[PDB]
Amino acid sequence: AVYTLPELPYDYSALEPYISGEIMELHHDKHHKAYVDGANTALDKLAEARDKADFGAINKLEKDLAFNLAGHVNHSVFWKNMAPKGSAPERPTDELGAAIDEFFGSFDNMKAQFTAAATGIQGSGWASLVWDPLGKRINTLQFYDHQNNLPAGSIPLLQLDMWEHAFYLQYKNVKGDYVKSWWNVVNWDDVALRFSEARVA
Amino acid sequence: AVYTLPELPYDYSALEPYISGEIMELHHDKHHKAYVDGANTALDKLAEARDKADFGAINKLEKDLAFNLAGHVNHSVFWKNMAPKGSAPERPTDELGAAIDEFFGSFDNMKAQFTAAATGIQGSGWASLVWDPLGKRINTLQFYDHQNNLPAGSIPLLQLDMWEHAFYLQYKNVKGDYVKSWWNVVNWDDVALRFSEARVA
Amino acid sequence: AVYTLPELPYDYSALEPYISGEIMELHHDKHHKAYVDGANTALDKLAEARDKADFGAINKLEKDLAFNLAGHVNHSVFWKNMAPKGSAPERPTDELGAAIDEFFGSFDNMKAQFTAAATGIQGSGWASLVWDPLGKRINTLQFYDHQNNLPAGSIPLLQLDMWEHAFYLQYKNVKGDYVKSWWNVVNWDDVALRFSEARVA
Amino acid sequence: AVYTLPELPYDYSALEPYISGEIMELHHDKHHKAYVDGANTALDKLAEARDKADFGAINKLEKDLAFNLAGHVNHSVFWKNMAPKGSAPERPTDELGAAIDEFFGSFDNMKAQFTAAATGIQGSGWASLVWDPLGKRINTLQFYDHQNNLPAGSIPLLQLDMWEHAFYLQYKNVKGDYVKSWWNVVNWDDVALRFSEARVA
Ligand SMILES: [Mn+2]
Ligand SMILES: [Mn+2]
Ligand SMILES: [Mn+2]
Ligand SMILES: [Mn+2]
Numbered sequence: 179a180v181y182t183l184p185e186l187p188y189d190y191s192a193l194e195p196y197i198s199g200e201i202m203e204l205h206h207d208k209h210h211k212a213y214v215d216g217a218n219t220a221l222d223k224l225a226e227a228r229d230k231a232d233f234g235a236i237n238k239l240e241k242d243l244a245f246n247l248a249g250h251v252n253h254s255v256f257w258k259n260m261a262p263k264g265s266a267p268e269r270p271t272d273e274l275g276a277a278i279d280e281f282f283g284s285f286d287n288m289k290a291q292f293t294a295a296a297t298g299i300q301g302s303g304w305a306s307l308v309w310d311p312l313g314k315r316i317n318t319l320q321f322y323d324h325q326n327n328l329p330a331g332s333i334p335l336l337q338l339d340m341w342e343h344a345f346y347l348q349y350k351n352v353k354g355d356y357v358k359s360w361w362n363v364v365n366w367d368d369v370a371l372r373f374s375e376a377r378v379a
Numbered sequence: 380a381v382y383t384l385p386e387l388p389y390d391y392s393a394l395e396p397y398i399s400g401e402i403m404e405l406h407h408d409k410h411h412k413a414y415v416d417g418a419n420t421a422l423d424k425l426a427e428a429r430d431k432a433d434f435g436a437i438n439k440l441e442k443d444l445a446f447n448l449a450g451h452v453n454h455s456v457f458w459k460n461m462a463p464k465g466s467a468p469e470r471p472t473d474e475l476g477a478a479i480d481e482f483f484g485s486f487d488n489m490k491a492q493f494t495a496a497a498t499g500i501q502g503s504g505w506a507s508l509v510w511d512p513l514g515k516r517i518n519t520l521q522f523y524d525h526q527n528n529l530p531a532g533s534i535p536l537l538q539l540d541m542w543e544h545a546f547y548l549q550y551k552n553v554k555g556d557y558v559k560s561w562w563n564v565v566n567w568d569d570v571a572l573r574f575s576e577a578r579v580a
Numbered sequence: 581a582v583y584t585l586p587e588l589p590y591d592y593s594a595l596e597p598y599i600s601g602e603i604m605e606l607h608h609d610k611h612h613k614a615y616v617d618g619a620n621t622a623l624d625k626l627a628e629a630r631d632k633a634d635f636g637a638i639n640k641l642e643k644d645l646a647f648n649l650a651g652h653v654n655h656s657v658f659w660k661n662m663a664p665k666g667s668a669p670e671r672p673t674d675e676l677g678a679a680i681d682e683f684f685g686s687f688d689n690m691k692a693q694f695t696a697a698a699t700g701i702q703g704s705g706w707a708s709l710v711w712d713p714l715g716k717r718i719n720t721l722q723f724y725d726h727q728n729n730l731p732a733g734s735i736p737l738l739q740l741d742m743w744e745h746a747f748y749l750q751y752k753n754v755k756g757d758y759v760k761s762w763w764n765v766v767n768w769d770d771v772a773l774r775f776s777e778a779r780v781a
Numbered sequence: 782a783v784y785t786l787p788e789l790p791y792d793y794s795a796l797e798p799y800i801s802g803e804i805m806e807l808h809h810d811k812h813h814k815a816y817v818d819g820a821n822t823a824l825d826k827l828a829e830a831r832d833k834a835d836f837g838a839i840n841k842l843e844k845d846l847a848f849n850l851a852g853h854v855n856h857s858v859f860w861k862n863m864a865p866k867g868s869a870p871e872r873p874t875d876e877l878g879a880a881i882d883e884f885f886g887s888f889d890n891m892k893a894q895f896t897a898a899a900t901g902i903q904g905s906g907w908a909s910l911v912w913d914p915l916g917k918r919i920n921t922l923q924f925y926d927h928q929n930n931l932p933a934g935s936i937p938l939l940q941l942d943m944w945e946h947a948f949y950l951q952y953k954n955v956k957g958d959y960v961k962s963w964w965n966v967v968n969w970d971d972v973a974l975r976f977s978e979a980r981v982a
Pocket of ligand 4: 856944947
């Protein structure tokens with residue numbers, strides 16, 4: 179198909195004890211697969227709509243496409259943004275580190291803003307550190323669901339899934355503990371690479 | 380001076396009779412100007428929040444940022460996507476044209492899908508032709524307001540403002556006439572340029 | 581059909597000079613009629629879905645129903661909430677007046693909160709004075725489009741349409757002047773009646 | 782003390798094995814409690830705004846009010862809509878039953894439409910059976926989050942929480958099993974009571 183489910187770059191239990199393998203399996207094998215399948219279906223439906231010149235369901239198809247594709251993009255980024263603690267360094271280094279100090283003042287400032295954005299979401303959503311092509315800067319955005327509350331052209335660098343399915347089985351309603359534990363498995367090397375390729379657009 | 384109001388690449392009345400000069404003036408000078416100020420203000424507010432370590436209004440600020448920055452991005456592309464009748468080819472050619480035929484079957488099919496997405500919006504929004512970096516293809520998206528119903532990483536190639544302020548003074552409630560008339564001023568050279576640079580991401 | 585387009589309780593030009601007859605005609609005859617037709621169509625589609633046991637388009641149909649029915653409800657209330665200046669009294673009287681002083685402090689306080697809610701909307705929307713059945717109080721709500729940002733059970737008492745089609749032809753981008761002029765045509769007798777029948781639920 | 786957390790009309794484990802006591806406890810004690818506090822806080826904030834004549838955060842406060850108050854309303858109806866298996870009739874009777882057959886053809890048709898609306902939600906939301914005062918009929922609505930996709934004046938009769946926290950601990954990703962199991966604890970006497978009082982509006 180057009181979209182395919184990427185494999186995890188590590189074992190399902192590699193992120194423990196911070197993130198359980200039980201969540202990783204359901205999150206990847208079930209939820210992410212669903213978005214991939216939904217994005218492919220939306221495209222097939224759009225294709226049939228053009229062939230028959232019937233765009234009656236255009237509003238539905240465009241939302242299906244945006245919702246599912248955004249879900250695929252967000253999760254694909256999410257998997258690579260993590261790595262077992264000890265494998266990747268903590269705290270941004272070199273160019274990324276400097277850029278963070280430039281646009282946020284310091285790493286602690288960025289972390290606090292990102293955390294506030296993650297825990298304050300009213301509904302399902304994401305906390306996202308993106309590259310703004312227009313302002314040539316790094317900003318934090320609070321996505322609603324998967325596809326709402328973000329400017330076009332935004333390039334994701336670091337994302338934290340705040341949908342309840344991402345943490346409920348282990349942290350229950352305490353989203354704060356989930357965010358705190360998550361900081362331990364952030365793969366700053368992946369975010370650094372994304373930043374390198376992002377700022378050239 | 381992080382965000383600035385770009386000047387129109389043509390005179391306010393250069394798009395007539397398709398889009399009146401009265402609309403171009405109010406649209407650029409008043410509306411677009413507002414989103415630039417709002418985007419700048421949101422960043423200043425976020426910087427103040429970090430300085431005082433008070434992220435109590437993070438939800439408001441993240442939406443102020445997304446809404447205004449997206450408005451700024453969308454209108455910035457919109458102005459360049461247009462040019463006086465006779466300035467550029469009335470139909471895509473070369474790689475852009477071949478890509479359109481590849482992802483939509485034909486130029487007419489693309490126009491039909493884009494038009495349906497533009498006229499069907501339930502509320503304020505945009506019809507948008509974007510480059511999908513993940514699927515490596517061109518898709519049409521239907522934005523709600525300025526910042527909703529789109530995947531992160533979407534590169535805008537061609538956009539049509541469907542907010543009522545974009546056409547009400549001239550076309551009133553007849554959205555169909557506005558869209559049909561708009562096709563006459565589309566600058567395919569701009570779109571082709573955006574496509575060339577998008578594919579290299 | 582199930583839903584019908586209500587006739588205006590006054591001539592199209594009765595609200596002048598505050599609201600032009602040109603806007604009243606388009607707003608009522610075109611925009612409102614569209615919501616009535618759309619709500620009826622949504623119900624017919626839902627009926628067919630049940631007959632054939634095909635709920636594939638349920639997400640589309642539920643949004644179509646909510647969007648259009650909310651549009652019908654909001655506009656129906658909107659027409660009755662207005663009357664030619666001099667016909668209806670200015671400032672709430674008796675029970676309504678007391679309730680407003682109780683839940684807002686004073687009439688000026690309510691008017692200021694309502695005005696701020698009306699002019700600050702980021703996209704299409706409504707400023708609404710509703711009766712809260714659960715808290716047994718009058719609150720101001722800011723609707724997005726027609727059907728978003730409101731609790732179920734909310735009973736509208738006074739509504740102000742902030743969609744651009746409601747004021748653009750006369751006030752252009754200056755929504756502030758539109759709200760200020762609108763206060764002159766509010767039919768406080770209609771709001772009083774709605775309040776009388778609302779607080780018994 | 783404007784908004785208060787209602788107590789469950791039954792023990793936390795009274796709905797087992799359909800809905801676990803663990804979920805009922807967290808759902809009522811933690812989640813519902815949060816919306817009550819948020820709704821109270823929003824009103825206090827709005828009162829403070831009026832006192833100081835500063836409505837700068839009106840957009841944030843109106844959403845805080847709508848989101849939290851709607852969460853409060855939705856969960857308040859939800860608890861009462863349920864009762865231990867064997868407490869009430871497993872199928873609507875009398876006027877409620879006749880009304881369901883009138884507006885949906887049959888009870889099974891209603892269940893099918895309600896179920897489709899519940900399982901198809903793209904994000905957090907609610908499946909809801911409401912009384913439409915304008916059309917004088919019973920419709921099914923699909924709420925997004927707590928406060929989106931619904932017309933003002935909608936009277937909630939029966940509601941099903943589709944937020945992940947409502948079923949993830951027990952049913953994981955299998956939404957279909959949660960909905961099917963939920964039908965077994967629906968208190969039709971409560972719904973019938975709400976219908977009787979709704980029709981008298
Ligand atoms: Mn997820
Ligand atoms: Mn515009
Ligand atoms: Mn209107
Ligand atoms: Mn809940």
